Design a protein around this ligand. Structure first.
Ligand SMILES: CCCCCCCCCCCCCC(=O)O
Ligand SMILES: CCCCCCCCCCCCCC(=O)O
Ligand SMILES: CCCCCCCCCCCCCC(=O)O
Ligand SMILES: NCCCCCCCCCCCC(=O)O
Ligand SMILES: NCCCCCCCCCCCC(=O)O
Lengths: 289, 60, 252, 238, 289, 238, 60, 60, 60
């Protein structure tokens, strides 16, 4: 069907257990050759006598759409209402889903993915700690601005650049529902690439990996009231919920912890946990030993 | 110009459907396709040319 | 008359010349598990006659001051012939039962017993912040005894009849399948219980599907009635027993 | 003005909600779709693929190719059990980092039959028969071949067909088991024994390895999404 | 019909009183045998002369759905905006309806129940008492996160775990309507079980009762602004409204008070209240004695 | 933007509201329904079932099986009334903790006829006739059999049919009475008398017990949900 | 694709109905079934095989 | 989400408004109506009835 | 399943009507019946058996 539509029937039922009786033949379903690279299609009924079971179990929650389509925090940063640093008056990062692991490991199960994204922002502010704490600051209004690669970059909370005549921006005031919007599949290519065993330069050097393929611009966020007698500080959290998904060439789930955002680097890590012996099976069922 | 389709069945073995209307000009704005359930394990579990009947030897 | 009645399961038959009726579960007769209700995929064993027949448990004595008695159920029949053997060898089991409580006296005796099957009779501890024992719960055949006063002791069930070991009003146990044995009119009680649980099958050692309680509400009494010995006997017969998940026998 | 009442829930942000939202890029012309090979559609497609089980996950093998080798040998060792392990696909070390296991860990419930494929890697002149048994819960692990053969089992004859499949049929009181398994949702164990020792001619190695692969059958499904215990971080720039 | 649908006709009328006159026969409706375990079906017209009454009374409000379908508090806890304990910075419990009695006694009238649940949360915050009370804290935004059994558990208000890439979470800001959502019938079994006369271990030991069957995960809730100059404290209250209900094998209503959450334990308690004598009936109708 | 006006009520949380709400678990596949015996559908199904009335709720019997036994005996006791009690199903000790009573306590209004079944538990050789009377409100409780027989009553003959049913027809100025009954919604009393003493042959006990069961007839209903007075707590971990 | 059904009757012996549309994809999201009023006391008050006519003795 | 604009008046409480509101007692079965004599329908029915005028409303 | 009826006429001697849909399950939730205008003064102003024609004496 069309993977852009918000409706589409059909139950995802698993297989019924076919009733099976005794057998004496040359059929040898339980004997295969794993060398071929084929995974055996044996079901219980091929190796034991089974009853018939009408199975209603469905695989609805393990569909790629339902697995990825849940908002995940992919970034968080702070900025102050007032400070001497100018820089600390606004936040900015470079769009990517590589800075928070949960989301990253989920995506990295697939080599390529294509999708629209529902972005939701959760912004909070707190009054900074100090000796004098009394003030009456009106509601804070924030501005989130997206700068596609190549656009002029803000240099202060009051730069002309925040005019957003063309960059898309969101103005939001505290106390209301978190801001939200959909972004289409924005790639230069036919699918976003999660891994790239390649370089940026033709001479097989330059930058290696995911980074050379990125370049989706950055986000800048600042307060608009711009002031507060006493210092305050806000935290902006951004969430991604992919929707209308397509994925290709699955790969094993990341086993070693991530070391940084630009690389696939890792330290050698254990295949799994140890146990006492290759025959160790704990004894449950005892008058409690 | 709306669409009516069925709901995922809950707590029991006509009022089991919902209606939806799209209010935006871009497909990106639409909700997720949580109801599409296709499947093709074959690409991965059995990518062998020469069909393996497996009830037969597999070699020989 | 309709007081007369006979029942046959396997190589066994019961008779009464003074029955009331026969109570049936919540109106449901036992049935074997249907394909559209099953999860365990292996072929079941259905021993039939070897297993679905009348087993008689050890009798108890009704004394002028007996508070009552109880038995937990799949456990209690665990040593009864092949029904018990099939229990030991399988992970999953399912059965219904015909329960027949017998108690005869004389036209000059009096007393009244409530005979109830309580599904899922989770019991409370004597020691309020402690927990029970399997021993405080059941002793297989034999039978635990209710008590006329509050009990103490760690692990034992708080058994004052008045609260039926469950924290309710004993006199409300009637929402459960039951019959009364009023000596002046009746000499036995028969209840057919269907399998009742929130899963299609279950392990028979780990879960007491239901408890049988015999509680005298009007006490035994008589005169120079050279019969002071008035026993009560419980006979039960598994119905539609089926088992799944065969392997080595469970550790006693 | 059309009359309206806001219901509880108004203005909340539920992670798993599913609503329409304005696009910040009106009329953006998305790049054409390209037909890439290997499209995945349901995580179960991945769980249905065999992956190698680290059966020999003994201290000292945790970072060496041995953890994947089950040692078996010539001579009299019948009394000696070849291996055994619990059937907790999403929890026990033997399975948790498997393709099937990693997937189960993103869910809280599972149900279905499992396939265990065993492949013999000795010389072609080697010979032998093994007994592969699965015991549903309720008793302790068989301690002898006698006890093990009373449960579900195949007798595997090593031959030209290098591999043998022990399928673990779904036998449970409940339709589902916790991936984070407890005793209530126990699934039993599988153990392996020499049915008739490994015989070999002269000039060939007297000991070899058997490998074990796991994969889900077609009656397998999972429910109730949750995060994996397996990945974490102490700070950003992740 | 289908017990998942929000509409379904038919009036639940009680029985009309059939007009009855004088009788002299062998009919003996007022004489039955309670020993059979059958409840007599006698109506007024079988024992006295009755007029005819067209009765319009309906049993609508005693239908299982209308009896259980009202939100009930099933839990309440506190957490602080700021403290030295780290632990006191977020709240967490294990889902169950066994900690508040009203709801619990209602459910326990049935042995098994099956239903979807409408969860509504009421969150409130107060400023803690102290010598200095002046501050200007922006609106508090909370995060409620559900952790299915087996998911990683937060260890501090700033744990990576709150990223909820997959656990479902709710972000809500004070002043708005209480947060709410529906949860489907989530059991591993065919019906939630309110009582379980059984064990966790096959050797008839381990844990006894309801608890072995539970395991529905837990809830964690924390503030997101994370700060406040002066200490504040919030209370989270969770309400359950079952809907689309089915119930089986009714049992007597709990008579003795509950002693704890994990057990059915109780102390011996009176069957009912006493009165003077078995014939005592107070005299109303007197020129006031 | 479509024009809208919020009405009073917007954003409130009413315990008994009834609205749709987003699911936090999109597409969750619920486990199949199983046909369990004993499905309940209306609490009245429970109230229609007989349960034993603690008629002898006298000080000292509150925790013993006696509270359920009505004492009756051989010899001349005609002047002596056997028992009596008010008809306040949800309020008087005699009824409040009954199956019918516990249910009535979750409501504020009730209406309908009530069945009182009396069962004789003496020896089979025992004999006797009793007069079971119900007096609608307006006068004080009959103080003699003469006065009692002027109201609604059955004369019960002990015989093979061990039980007798006194049905209390609904007679009231209003269609409903408060479960928390007051004088305005009074319902009267039922009293019992020897109609002709208990006679018995030699060798049999000269005193026995009569039990009393209560249940609702089919014209019975209840309204206006409220919490029960009967359950409470001082703190959580309940 | 909506449903119209009747309202519970109030303060008096066509405008006595309401309309509803489901906006969610899961049945769990729907409102309660407050209008279903079946009943079967029998399971409990009369679970005896052998029908008791009661106008007849019940024993004998 | 369907696009909406709140108009002046939103959230006010006008004594003489006239809107629908959720019932706090879902499915309550009201007691049957009874035909009482003397039903009034418009206050003018009362004003159309003669009443005695206090014409001699003099001090005392 | 909605109802259209006319509005009370205002400031002048088709667009003079409104539409309504009931969203609740109980009649109690509905808005007021401000448009019902019956009347029967008779119950009160003339409850005499024996019809008084009044254009005739009334006595005699
Ligand atoms: C671009 C904003 C468009 C607003 C669309 C709102 C649709 C309102 C439902 C109208 C009734 C359905 C008509 C059919 O189709
Ligand atoms: C998933 C969100 C769907 C939004 C559905 C709103 C339906 C608006 C009423 C439209 C007019 C009724 C059409 C018919 O049927
Ligand atoms: C119980 C809540 C029900 C919500 C009902 C909203 C009705 C929306 C108007 C839909 C268009 C009219 C269909 C016709 O009739
Ligand atoms: N104001 C929001 C700007 C959003 C642009 C987001 C582009 C997200 C692309 C998702 C990329 C994930 C990947 O590399 O797989
Ligand atoms: N964020 C809410 C998570 C809700 C899960 C609730 C599951 C409720 C199950 C109701 C259980 C009641 C019972 O044991 O009978």
């Amino acid at each position: 069907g069309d993977v852009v539509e918000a409706v589409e029937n059909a139950v995802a039922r698993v297989a019924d257990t076919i009733g099976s009786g005794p057998s004496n033949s040359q059929a040898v379903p339980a004997l295969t050759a794993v060398e071929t690279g084929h995974t055996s299609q044996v079901t219980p009924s091929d190796t034991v006598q089974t009853r018939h079971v009408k199975n209603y179990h469905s695989r609805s929650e393990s569909s790629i759409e339902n697995f990825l389509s849940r908002s995940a925090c992919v970034y968080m940063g702070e900025y102050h209402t007032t400070n001497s640093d100018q820089t600390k008056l606004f936040a900015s990062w470079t769009i990517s889903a590589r800075r928070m692991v949960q989301m990253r490991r989920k995506l990295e199960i697939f080599t390529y993915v294509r999708f629209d994204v529902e972005v939701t922002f959760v912004i909070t502010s707190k009054q900074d700690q100090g000796t004098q704490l009394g003030q009456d600051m009106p509601p804070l209004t924030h501005q989130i601005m997206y700068i596609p690669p190549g656009g002029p970059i803000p240099k202060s909370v009051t730069d002309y650049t925040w005019q957003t005549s063309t960059n898309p921006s969101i103005f939001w005031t505290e106390g209301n529902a978190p801001p939200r919007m959909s972004i289409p599949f924005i790639s230069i290519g036919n699918a976003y690439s999660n891994f790239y065993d390649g370089w940026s330069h033709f001479s097989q050097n330059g930058v290696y990996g995911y980074n050379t393929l990125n370049h989706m611009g950055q986000i800048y966020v600042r307060h608009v009231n711009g002031s507060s007698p006493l210092p305050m500080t806000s935290t902006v959290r951004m969430y991604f919920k992919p929707k209308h998904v397509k994925a290709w060439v699955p790969r094993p789930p990341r086993l070693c912890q991530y070391k940084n955002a630009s690389t696939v680097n890792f330290s050698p890590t254990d295949i799994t946990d140890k146990r006492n012996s290759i025959t160790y099976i704990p004894d449950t069922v005892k008058p409690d030993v | 110009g709306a669409q009516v389709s069925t709901q995922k069945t809950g707590a029991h073995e006509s009022i089991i459907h919902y209606t939806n209307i799209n209010y935006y000009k871009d497909a990106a704005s639409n909700s997720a396709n949580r109801q599409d359930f296709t499947q093709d394990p074959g690409k991965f579990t059995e990518p062998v040319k020469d069909i393996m009947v497996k009830s037969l030897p597999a070699l020989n | 008359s309709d007081r007369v009645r006979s029942i046959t399961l396997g190589n066994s038959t019961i008779t009464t010349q003074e029955s009331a009726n026969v109570v049936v579960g919540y109106g449901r007769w036992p049935e074997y598990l249907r394909d559209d209700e099953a999860t365990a995929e292996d072929q079941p064993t259905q021993p039939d006659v070897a297993t679905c027949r009348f087993y008689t448990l050890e009798s108890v004595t009704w004394e002028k001051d007996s508070p009552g008695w109880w038995w937990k159920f799949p456990d209690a029949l665990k040593d009864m012939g092949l029904f018990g053997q099939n229990m030991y060898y399988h992970y999953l089991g399912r059965a219904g039962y015909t329960i027949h409580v017998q108690c005869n006296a004389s036209k000059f005796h009096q007393g009244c017993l409530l005979v109830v099957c309580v599904p899922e009779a989770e019991m409370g501890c004597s020691t309020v912040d402690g927990t029970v024992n399997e021993h405080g719960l059941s002793e297989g055949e034999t039978a635990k005894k209710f008590s006329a006063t509050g009990t103490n002791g760690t692990n034992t069930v708080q058994s004052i009849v008045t609260n039926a070991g469950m924290g309710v009003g004993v006199g409300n146990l009637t929402i459960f399948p039951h019959q009364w044995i009023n000596l002046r009119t009746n000499n036995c009680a028969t209840i057919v219980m269907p399998y009742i649980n929130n899963v299609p099958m279950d392990n028979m050692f780990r879960h007491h599907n239901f408890t049988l309680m015999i509680i005298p509400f009007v006490p035994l009494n008589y005169s120079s009635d050279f019969s002071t010995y008035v026993p009560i006997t419980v006979t039960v017969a598994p119905m539609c027993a089926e088992y799944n998940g065969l392997r080595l026998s469970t550790a006693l | 003005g059309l009359p309206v009442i806001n219901t509880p829930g108004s203005n909340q942000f539920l992670t798993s909600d599913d609503f329409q939202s304005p696009s910040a890029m009106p009329q953006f012309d998305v790049t054409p779709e390209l037909n890439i090979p290997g499209e995945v559609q349901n995580l179960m497609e991945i769980a249905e693929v065999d992956s190698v089980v680290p059966v020999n996950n003994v201290a000292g093998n945790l970072e060496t190719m041995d953890i994947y080798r089950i040692p078996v040998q010539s001579g009299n060792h019948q009394s000696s059990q070849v291996f055994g392990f619990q059937v907790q696909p999403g929890l026990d070390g033997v399975f948790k980092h498997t393709l099937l296991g990693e997937i189960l860990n993103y869910y809280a419930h599972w149900s279905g039959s499992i396939k265990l494929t065993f492949v013999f890697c000795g010389s072609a002149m080697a010979t032998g028969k093994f007994l592969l048994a699965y015991a549903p819960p309720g008793a302790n692990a068989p301690k002898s071949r006698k006890d093990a053969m009373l449960g579900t089992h195949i007798i595997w004859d090593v031959g030209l067909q290098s591999s043998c499949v022990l399928c673990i049929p779904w036998i449970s009181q409940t339709h589902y088991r916790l991936v984070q398994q407890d005793e209530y949702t126990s699934a039993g164990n599988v153990t392996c024994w020499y049915q008739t020792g490994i015989v070999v001619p002269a000039g060939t190695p007297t000991s070899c390895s058997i490998m074990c692969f796991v994969s889900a059958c077609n009656d397998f499904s999972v429910r109730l999404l949750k995060d994996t215990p397996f990945i974490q971080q102490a700070a950003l720039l992740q």
